[PDB]
Amino acid sequence: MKVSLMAAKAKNGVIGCGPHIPWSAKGEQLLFKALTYNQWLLVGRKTFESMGALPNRKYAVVTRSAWTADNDNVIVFPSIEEAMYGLAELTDHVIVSGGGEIYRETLPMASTLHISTIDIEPEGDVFFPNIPNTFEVVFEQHFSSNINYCYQIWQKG
Amino acid sequence: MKVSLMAAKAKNGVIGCGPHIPWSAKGEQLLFKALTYNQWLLVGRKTFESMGALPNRKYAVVTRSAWTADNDNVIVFPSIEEAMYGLAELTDHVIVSGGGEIYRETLPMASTLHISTIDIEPEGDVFFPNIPNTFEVVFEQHFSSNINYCYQIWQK
Numbered sequence: 001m002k003v004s005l006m007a008a009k010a011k012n013g014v015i016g017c018g019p020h021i022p023w024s025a026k027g028e029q030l031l032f033k034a035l036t037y038n039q040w041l042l043v044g045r046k047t048f049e050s051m052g053a054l055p056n057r058k059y060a061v062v063t064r065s066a067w068t069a070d071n072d073n074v075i076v077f078p079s080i081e082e083a084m085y086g087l088a089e090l091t092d093h094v095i096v097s098g099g100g101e102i103y104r105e106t107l108p109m110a111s112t113l114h115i116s117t118i119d120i121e122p123e124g125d126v127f128f129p130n131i132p133n134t135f136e137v138v139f140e141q142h143f144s145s146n147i148n149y150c151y152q153i154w155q156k157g
Numbered sequence: 158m159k160v161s162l163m164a165a166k167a168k169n170g171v172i173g174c175g176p177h178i179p180w181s182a183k184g185e186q187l188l189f190k191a192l193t194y195n196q197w198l199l200v201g202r203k204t205f206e207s208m209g210a211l212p213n214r215k216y217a218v219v220t221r222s223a224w225t226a227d228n229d230n231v232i233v234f235p236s237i238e239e240a241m242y243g244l245a246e247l248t249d250h251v252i253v254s255g256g257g258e259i260y261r262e263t264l265p266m267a268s269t270l271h272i273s274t275i276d277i278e279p280e281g282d283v284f285f286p287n288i289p290n291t292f293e294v295v296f297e298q299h300f301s302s303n304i305n306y307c308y309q310i311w312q313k
């Protein structure tokens with residue numbers, strides 16, 4: 001099973017401010033919707049609660065508590081290793097879609113990264129990890145918008 | 158100026174049947190939307206008439222006749238050479254978005270290709286060109302849908 005990771009980060013590394021993503025970049029949500037369409041997503045419990053079970057995707061959520069989802073489109077796991085093992089029975093591909101914690105915990109498992117960098121430097125208390133040099137950019141495209149953004153695909157060599 | 162090209166082709170190479178794309182692969186249009194957002198596109202006159210002048214894009218359209226367009230976001234050019242030369246003054250990047258004829262005439266100038274292959278072999282009279290071996294795939298992702306599709310990005 002292949003693990004991808006999709007994230008949007010501000011120029012200063014911020015990805016979150018409390019339970020909110022602290023920018024609104026017109027156009028960027030299209031990439032996220034387009035690349036995740038009918039995909040399996042792996043998210044942390046907090047991210048899942050902020051985003052919800054959006055239509056046309058399937059969800060693996062991890063929690064350390066007895067927390068549960070209300071939805072036969074979501075599988076809840078007690079660990080990332082269990083989620084990975086369970087997902088590999090259902091699909092050959094999962095896209096890690098966030099939580100700062102989940103990103104830190106799964107970045108060494110990822111073999112391709114979908115990284116949108118937003119031309120803004122907001123306040124926030126949740127950050128994206130530094131991208132290790134195990135990965136290289138293989139595609140990049142710039143977008144002008146109300147807030148500009150740059151989409152890069154990174155591959156593990 | 159950078160030239161990209163983006164297309165959806167069936168597994169038998171068909172991209173069109175008359176004025177129509179001969180399939181509906183639910184979700185694939187999202188890729189096209191995402192990659193063309195606030196971009197300049199280059200299209201042939203027939204493809205432009207088949208498509209809306211959809212929002213948040215600017216359209217260079219080529220024709221050999223007297224055809225013209227109302228929409229403020231469209232510039233009409235008499236040839237590909239003139240479109241390319243005039244686009245270079247207007248933008249840093251154009252995405253060639255089709256016409257079989259337009260794809261044939263512009264594939265040699267593209268440096269990256271966005272290619273969605275649709276899990277179908279329909280009837281049609283317009284085909285995508287042979288991709289030269291100067292291009293290689295740098296990214297690939299499969300999608301399951303009513304008709305499955307595979308998204309590949311090629312770099313020259």
Ligand SMILES: NC(=O)c1ccc[n+]([C@@H]2O[C@H](COP(=O)([O-])OP(=O)(O)OC[C@H]3O[C@@H](n4cnc5c(N)ncnc54)[C@H](OP(=O)(O)O)[C@@H]3O)[C@@H](O)[C@H]2O)c1
Binds near residue numbers: 006016048
């Ligand atoms: N810009 C972006 O790309 C993007 C994307 C997504 C989210 N965000 C932002 O990121 C922030 C949320 O990130 P976060 O780090 O606070 O939370 P998170 O990663 O979304 O979720 C953390 C929770 O997941 C569970 N968890 C984490 N690791 C686990 C493990 N190894 N085993 C079992 N359960 C595990 C725990 O759930 P329990 O507490 O239930 O035990 C933990 O509290 C928000 O601000 C959101 O807006 C940004």
Ligand SMILES: NC(=O)c1ccc[n+]([C@@H]2O[C@H](COP(=O)([O-])OP(=O)(O)OC[C@H]3O[C@@H](n4cnc5c(N)ncnc54)[C@H](OP(=O)(O)O)[C@@H]3O)[C@@H](O)[C@H]2O)c1
Binds near residue numbers: 222
């Ligand atoms: N699946 C996909 O990725 C996709 C994408 C787009 C379109 N399509 C399909 O492709 C089909 C249309 O393709 P097509 O090849 O018939 O038409 P097209 O390439 O879209 O347009 C051809 C027209 O463009 C103009 N043109 C072409 N070369 C020119 C040049 N060098 N200088 C000036 N004008 C030039 C001419 O317009 P005039 O006739 O006005 O002189 C020509 O008739 C449709 O079926 C459509 O559904 C598929």
Ligand SMILES: CCc1nc(N)nc(N)c1C#C[C@H](C)c1cc(-c2ccc(C(N)=O)cc2)ccc1Cl
Binds near residue numbers: 021029032
């Ligand atoms: C578009 C942001 C983004 N970009 C890239 N590149 N990668 C990413 N991971 C994310 C993300 C995210 C989290 C998961 C999220 C998403 C949503 C949400 C809800 C509805 C829509 C929609 N427009 O329908 C879009 C997004 C809400 C809360 C959160 Cl927390």
Ligand SMILES: CCc1nc(N)nc(N)c1C#C[C@H](C)c1cc(-c2ccc(C(N)=O)cc2)ccc1Cl
Binds near residue numbers: 271
């Ligand atoms: C989306 C298919 C596609 N995929 C990839 N990968 N590359 C491409 N070039 C195209 C294309 C195309 C032509 C230009 C086209 C587009 C549209 C159209 C229809 C609906 C919407 C929408 N859903 O709002 C947006 C665009 C209609 C007719 C045509 Cl003839």
